[PDB]
Amino acid sequence: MKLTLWTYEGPPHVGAMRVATGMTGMHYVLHAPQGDTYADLLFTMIERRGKRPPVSYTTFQARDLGSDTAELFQSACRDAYERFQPQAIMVGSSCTAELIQDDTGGLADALSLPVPVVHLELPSYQRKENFGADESFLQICRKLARPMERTEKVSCNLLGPTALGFRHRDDILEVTRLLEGMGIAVNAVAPMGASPADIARLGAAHFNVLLYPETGESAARWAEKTLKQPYTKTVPIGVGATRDFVAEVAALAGVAPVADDSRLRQPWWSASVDSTYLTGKRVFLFGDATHVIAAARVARDEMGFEVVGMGCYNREFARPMRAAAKGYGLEALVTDDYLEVEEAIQALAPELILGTQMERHIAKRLGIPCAVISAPVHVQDFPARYSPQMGFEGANVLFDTWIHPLTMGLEEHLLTMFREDFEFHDEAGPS
Amino acid sequence: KVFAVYGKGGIGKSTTSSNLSAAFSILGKRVLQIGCDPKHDSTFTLTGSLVPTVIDVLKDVDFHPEELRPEDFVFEGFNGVMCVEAGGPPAGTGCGGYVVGQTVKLLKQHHLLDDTDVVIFDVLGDVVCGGFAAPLQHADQAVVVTANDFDSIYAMNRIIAAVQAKSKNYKVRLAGCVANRSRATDEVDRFCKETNFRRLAHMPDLDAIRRSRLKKKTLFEMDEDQDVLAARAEYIRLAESLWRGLDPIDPHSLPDREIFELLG
Amino acid sequence: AKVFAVYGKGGIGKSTTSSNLSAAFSILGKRVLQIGCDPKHDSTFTLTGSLVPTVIDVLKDVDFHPEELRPEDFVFEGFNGVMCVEAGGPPAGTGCGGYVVGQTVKLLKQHHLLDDTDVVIFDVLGDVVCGGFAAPLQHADQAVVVTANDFDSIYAMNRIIAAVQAKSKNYKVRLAGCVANRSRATDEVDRFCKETNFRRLAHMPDLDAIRRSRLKKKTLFEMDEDQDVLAARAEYIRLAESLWRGLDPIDPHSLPDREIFE
Amino acid sequence: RGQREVFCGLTGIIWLHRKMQDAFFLVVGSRTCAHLLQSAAGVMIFAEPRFGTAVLEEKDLAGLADANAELDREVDRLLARRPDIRQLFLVGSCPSEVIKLDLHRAAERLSAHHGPAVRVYNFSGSGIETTFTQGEDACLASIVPTLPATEARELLLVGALPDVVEDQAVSLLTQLGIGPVRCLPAHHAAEAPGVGPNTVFALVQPFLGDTHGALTRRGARHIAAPFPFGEEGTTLWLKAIADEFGVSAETFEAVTAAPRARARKAVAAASEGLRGKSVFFLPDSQLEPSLARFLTRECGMSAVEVGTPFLHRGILGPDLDLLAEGPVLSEGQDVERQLDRVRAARPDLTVCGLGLANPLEAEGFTTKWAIELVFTPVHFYEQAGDLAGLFSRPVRRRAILR
Numbered sequence A: 001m002k003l004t005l006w007t008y009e010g011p012p013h014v015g016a017m018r019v020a021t022g023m024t025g026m027h028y029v030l031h032a033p034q035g036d037t038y039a040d041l042l043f044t045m046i047e048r049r050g051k052r053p054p055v056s057y058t059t060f061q062a063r064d065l066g067s068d069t070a071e072l073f074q075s076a077c078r079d080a081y082e083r084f085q086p087q088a089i090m091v092g093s094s095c096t097a098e099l100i101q102d103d104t105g106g107l108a109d110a111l112s113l114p115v116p117v118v119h120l121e122l123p124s125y126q127r128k129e130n131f132g133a134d135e136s137f138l139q140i141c142r143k144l145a146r147p148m149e150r151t152e153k154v155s156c157n158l159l160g161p162t163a164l165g166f167r168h169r170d171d172i173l174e175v176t177r178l179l180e181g182m183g184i185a186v187n188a189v190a191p192m193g194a195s196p197a198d199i200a201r202l203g204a205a206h207f208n209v210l211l212y213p214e215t216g217e218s219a220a221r222w223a224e225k226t227l228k229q230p231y232t233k234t235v236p237i238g239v240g241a242t243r244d245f246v247a248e249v250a251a252l253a254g255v256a257p258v259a260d261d262s263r264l265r266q267p268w269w270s271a272s273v274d275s276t277y278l279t280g281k282r283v284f285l286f287g288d289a290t291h292v293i294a295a296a297r298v299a300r301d302e303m304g305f306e307v308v309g310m311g312c313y314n315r316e317f318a319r320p321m322r323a324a325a326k327g328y329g330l331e332a333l334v335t336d337d338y339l340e341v342e343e344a345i346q347a348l349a350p351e352l353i354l355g356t357q358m359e360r361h362i363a364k365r366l367g368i369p370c371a372v373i374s375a376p377v378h379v380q381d382f383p384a385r386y387s388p389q390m391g392f393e394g395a396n397v398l399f400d401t402w403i404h405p406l407t408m409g410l411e412e413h414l415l416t417m418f419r420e421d422f423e424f425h426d427e428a429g430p431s
Numbered sequence B: 001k002v003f004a005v006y007g008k009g010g011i012g013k014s015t016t017s018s019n020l021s022a023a024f025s026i027l028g029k030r031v032l033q034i035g036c037d038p039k040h041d042s043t044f045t046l047t048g049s050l051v052p053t054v055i056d057v058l059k060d061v062d063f064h065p066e067e068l069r070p071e072d073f074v075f076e077g078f079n080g081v082m083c084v085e086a087g088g089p090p091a092g093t094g095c096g097g098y099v100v101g102q103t104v105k106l107l108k109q110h111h112l113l114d115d116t117d118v119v120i121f122d123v124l125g126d127v128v129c130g131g132f133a134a135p136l137q138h139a140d141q142a143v144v145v146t147a148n149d150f151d152s153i154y155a156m157n158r159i160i161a162a163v164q165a166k167s168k169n170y171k172v173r174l175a176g177c178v179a180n181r182s183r184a185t186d187e188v189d190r191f192c193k194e195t196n197f198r199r200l201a202h203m204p205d206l207d208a209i210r211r212s213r214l215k216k217k218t219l220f221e222m223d224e225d226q227d228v229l230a231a232r233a234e235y236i237r238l239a240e241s242l243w244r245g246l247d248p249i250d251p252h253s254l255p256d257r258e259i260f261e262l263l264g
Numbered sequence C: 001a002k003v004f005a006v007y008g009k010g011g012i013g014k015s016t017t018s019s020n021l022s023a024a025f026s027i028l029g030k031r032v033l034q035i036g037c038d039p040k041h042d043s044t045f046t047l048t049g050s051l052v053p054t055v056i057d058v059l060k061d062v063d064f065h066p067e068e069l070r071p072e073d074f075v076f077e078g079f080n081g082v083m084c085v086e087a088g089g090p091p092a093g094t095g096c097g098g099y100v101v102g103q104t105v106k107l108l109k110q111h112h113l114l115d116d117t118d119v120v121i122f123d124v125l126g127d128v129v130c131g132g133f134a135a136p137l138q139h140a141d142q143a144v145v146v147t148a149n150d151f152d153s154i155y156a157m158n159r160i161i162a163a164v165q166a167k168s169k170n171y172k173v174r175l176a177g178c179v180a181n182r183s184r185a186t187d188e189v190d191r192f193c194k195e196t197n198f199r200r201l202a203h204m205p206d207l208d209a210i211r212r213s214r215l216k217k218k219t220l221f222e223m224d225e226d227q228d229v230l231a232a233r234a235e236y237i238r239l240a241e242s243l244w245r246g247l248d249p250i251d252p253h254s255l256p257d258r259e260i261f262e
Numbered sequence D: 001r002g003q004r005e006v007f008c009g010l011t012g013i014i015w016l017h018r019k020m021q022d023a024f025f026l027v028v029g030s031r032t033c034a035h036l037l038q039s040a041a042g043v044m045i046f047a048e049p050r051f052g053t054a055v056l057e058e059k060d061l062a063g064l065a066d067a068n069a070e071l072d073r074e075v076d077r078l079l080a081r082r083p084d085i086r087q088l089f090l091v092g093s094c095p096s097e098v099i100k101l102d103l104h105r106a107a108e109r110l111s112a113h114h115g116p117a118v119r120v121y122n123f124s125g126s127g128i129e130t131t132f133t134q135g136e137d138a139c140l141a142s143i144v145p146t147l148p149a150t151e152a153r154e155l156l157l158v159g160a161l162p163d164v165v166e167d168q169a170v171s172l173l174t175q176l177g178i179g180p181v182r183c184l185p186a187h188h189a190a191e192a193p194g195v196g197p198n199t200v201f202a203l204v205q206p207f208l209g210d211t212h213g214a215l216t217r218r219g220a221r222h223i224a225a226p227f228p229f230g231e232e233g234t235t236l237w238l239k240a241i242a243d244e245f246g247v248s249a250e251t252f253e254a255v256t257a258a259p260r261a262r263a264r265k266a267v268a269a270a271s272e273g274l275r276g277k278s279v280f281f282l283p284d285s286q287l288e289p290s291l292a293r294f295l296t297r298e299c300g301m302s303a304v305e306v307g308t309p310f311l312h313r314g315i316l317g318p319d320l321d322l323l324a325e326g327p328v329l330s331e332g333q334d335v336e337r338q339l340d341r342v343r344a345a346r347p348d349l350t351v352c353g354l355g356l357a358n359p360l361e362a363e364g365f366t367t368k369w370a371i372e373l374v375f376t377p378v379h380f381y382e383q384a385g386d387l388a389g390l391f392s393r394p395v396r397r398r399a400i401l402r
């Protein structure tokens, strides 16, 4: 269909691995040809996970005959069982494993695994990595979670975080700090830190908190229906959104909406004579839909940036994005290829391209200030420092990370403007 | 427990599915009224909403993913928690090409697994066309509905043989040919003996149930039921007889061309 | 010859309309070739008393050869000289739905019965209108829309009209008008035809008189009952007179915006 | 049998497109191989690379002819956007093999339809046949049949090596009284070297197994010479080549005397941290034994397990002959046992795969991440102490951080 050199999302099985390795005691036994191991490298190196990603690969080098591949998958299931001792097993098929005729769950049941085995369907040719993560989450919630008694203290569930997320670690620290400072405890952050036991306990929290909608929204809906746990909707990225999120979780839990804004530096700093040059700067906004909508609110309100184009790479969340874009006077640019993004930036000629890894590079080729506000990123954008995005400290981060490229440009452009690079023009009266 | 509600008439066999949904909602179990009949008359008879939205054509959005939520396409309306109607894109609505439209297939691959108590499967309107027999893939307790008209009972027998045709691997059972006769026709009785099927809740008519109008409602939600309790009588019992396939009267349809029973 | 696309919803008056319209075509003295698609074999069987063998009947007795499709057996000639073929729907599960009727038409043309006759009245189903199922519409020149008089049936005829516009891709098939399956003199459809830019020919209700599946074994033009009156049959006679002169070919437009008034 | 960690052969494309320019690689497959190229290239993809994935959606799954037509359309579009292409490559991938979408017949279909200037060739980096470096092997081996023949003693050392090092090698080697060297002066055009009965090819990178077979099919003559990685490897390689081409050793001793001195001095300077450290040569790239002989002898190392995905003893026997037969080799690859052997043996330096590198380093193991040596210059004299340096790096970093 197309020559894809840049693909924002990855294959569905990669998202399934995100969820699997996010958990503690969950093996993702995956049917896959020899070589499809490469994603373990992504997890090991980009995110720098000490322990190897707890996923196995029934690599069929050249016994592609269904009799053989089934045996490899079965053997790998059982081997992953008594090797890594997981409390539950995740089994699915990837790419050619979908092409090869296998019963990805029937065999897993047939081996009579005492630990629960969650059967996964991942259509490897019409879906993407965000879907895959969300669906794997839905599956583990169905299998493991079960309605039980509400905890005595209102417990909020941090639904959504997974591994290899955009700052899915500092961010949950920040959100937990805000929530517990208001008083609500967290029952079990479900992925990016939740044993299958934690998922078993997901039915005791009062009200869910959908941290990252894209990877976890379907689990949130299932929670609302089965577990009867209402889930919040607003993502607290920024200050305005953070206040709204605080009020919303207060209402869902019936508590006071106290906010520790003593850390809030971004409002005051943006409202400073030092940085009034920001007003009237077109910013192009790309990346996954949640982060883009939140960045839209921040750029338009907190910073006074005039947003020129909002696009996303996940079609699954297009409708909210087109709603928002019609809000901001623009039209959404939901796409999947880097070409249309390059064209949109070229035509609109922004001055601050907040976007995914590829938008960063598009910026650098075009000489426009760049920043990263989304999921597709290499190892560099996964920092060691405390760099959340939601919460008040997230607002501070947002401020500095977004302003830093513009300041780089300004002091760069100054050093050019300065006489060291400007002793080339002269005028003598009437020439 | 998928209950494919077959038949010939438009408003017939479609009011019936809504009555099944109402009875099963009274029974409490979640119900999946997927109508998708070309006549916007399947979710109408249960919700009262004649044509809420036809998004199952997916024109405003290009493909399935765009609907981050089911709320746009699926609808609740009344106790029928899931009343959704595809409508079909024939030459009547848009271009169409084949009258398949594969909309039944779109509901097959719709969104995420909203399983609940499987599906009640109003569905249908395909009956037969080579390559336009999609609903057969999820049919599990397919039931054919007929009025007194001989064309309609022929429609039954044809459908039963046709479902046995494709259900070479699906092997859908048919617990009974619940009908929609109006005048207690003994010809349909002789047929039910001939087809060796089960038809107990077939007294539902097109005249006795407020003439099967399109302004009022069905079963519990409409005014004072029907003839005090006539509507409930056959339909609560249907939700206590066919509520599962515990009585699999599934035979071989017509044993040997037992259609030449025109009489008069 | 003079060909009309008669598309029935599936109502019981399919026989009463197709067979007796053809019978009147012959009553005025003209050669008839009725194509009544009814796998139950009722739409045309009454002109011969017994269940007519169509193209499909003999083409079923033999496997795939047309030389044993002899005239009287592959198109049964009915009363008053109505040689009326049928279309026996595909065997349950297998066989393209179109294939059957397509082969009926191709066999009628192979022996050049349409040229042999002066009538080609083309009664085909209107409930399932897939490309193959709606293929018979293209062959015919004019079109009359036989139907019951209720809102289920008006939706059915709008589906028929949609199939007509779909087959309008091929040639320039027209629509003579709309008639009933002996149900009512278009009190329930005429304003709808006006809505779709069409006319519904005022076909007098004939279901009011005594009727059976196909009026026992011979319909109104082939038995002594003769509907109510010879004028009740002169209704079909005047329809045949219109079908020679072929007035009002105007093609309606599809109406899917709840104009059915279900 | 078991979990294999080696990547698909498409990882060959990553360096193949740079080394053999004017060569586009259509890796027809799924989004999965697309992602693999994405991640592996890392920053190349931004620099307008010469590869890409022709994704097979469900639409292009059932109808193989439909997929063929779409692929032809895609190819025409690419060459229109990239007129500079001289040899397109229809490289198959695992989905492509499963769909049995024969790209050979497709290459026949679109050979000269959109211009005979694009010589479309087909190989298969699919993980279902090749293993990592077997990609470049397969690519060049499919190159071989299209190559012309020759009627002179021609030195066909296979050009899978960085142009700077290649220029160094050809300079010294021609200095050693040798003529045709498959060194196209500009190196920016299709080399099209002649392969005849008197053609003599010298294997340069070990992974090129089927290339050896292909040249043998073309009547070419192999050189059983130790591979030019370190000091003895490069020395024996040059000496062997000199003999077989007909050159004496007298001039050779003077030609590369200074290079030999630099190689030995640099290795002695970089192996200071490398003093009897145990090396577990995990099977990752089938390149291991050639590095091993260097380490164990002239670096002063202690090999434990010099494994390999595949073993081509026909071209490995020379290199192994210098290897001390103590250290075992491995034809059986499964992380389920490889990691256990590593953990039990406690080797001080292990060449794990990248996905195993960080985990293994977390278990008190200095891991030399192996993806470099294929990609970084580690060949010949000047770049032998460099190689020893990258090997001494992990232990020195461990030393600093304790």
Ligand code: PMR
Binding pocket: A041, A042, A043, A045, A046, A378, A379, D011, D014, D039, D040, D041, D042, D043, D354, D371, D372, D375
């Ligand atoms: C986790 C997947 C990943 C990423 C994002 C890249 C790019 C990149 N990989 Mg390495 N790298 C991964 C895989 C691969 N890299 C590839 C390329 C390449 C090499 C040769 C090199 C490298 C390295 C890296 C780097 C620098 C950060 C790092 O991963 O350590 C990126 C962004 C880079 C480095 O780490 O050493 C200084 C180094 O020199 N990549 C290839 C060859 C096909 C592989 C298997």
Ligand code: SF4
Binding pocket: B098, B099, B100, B129, B130, B131, B132, C096, C097, C098, C129, C130, C131, C132, C133
């Ligand atoms: S036979 Fe198949 S292709 Fe033809 S109209 Fe019917 S469904 Fe469409």
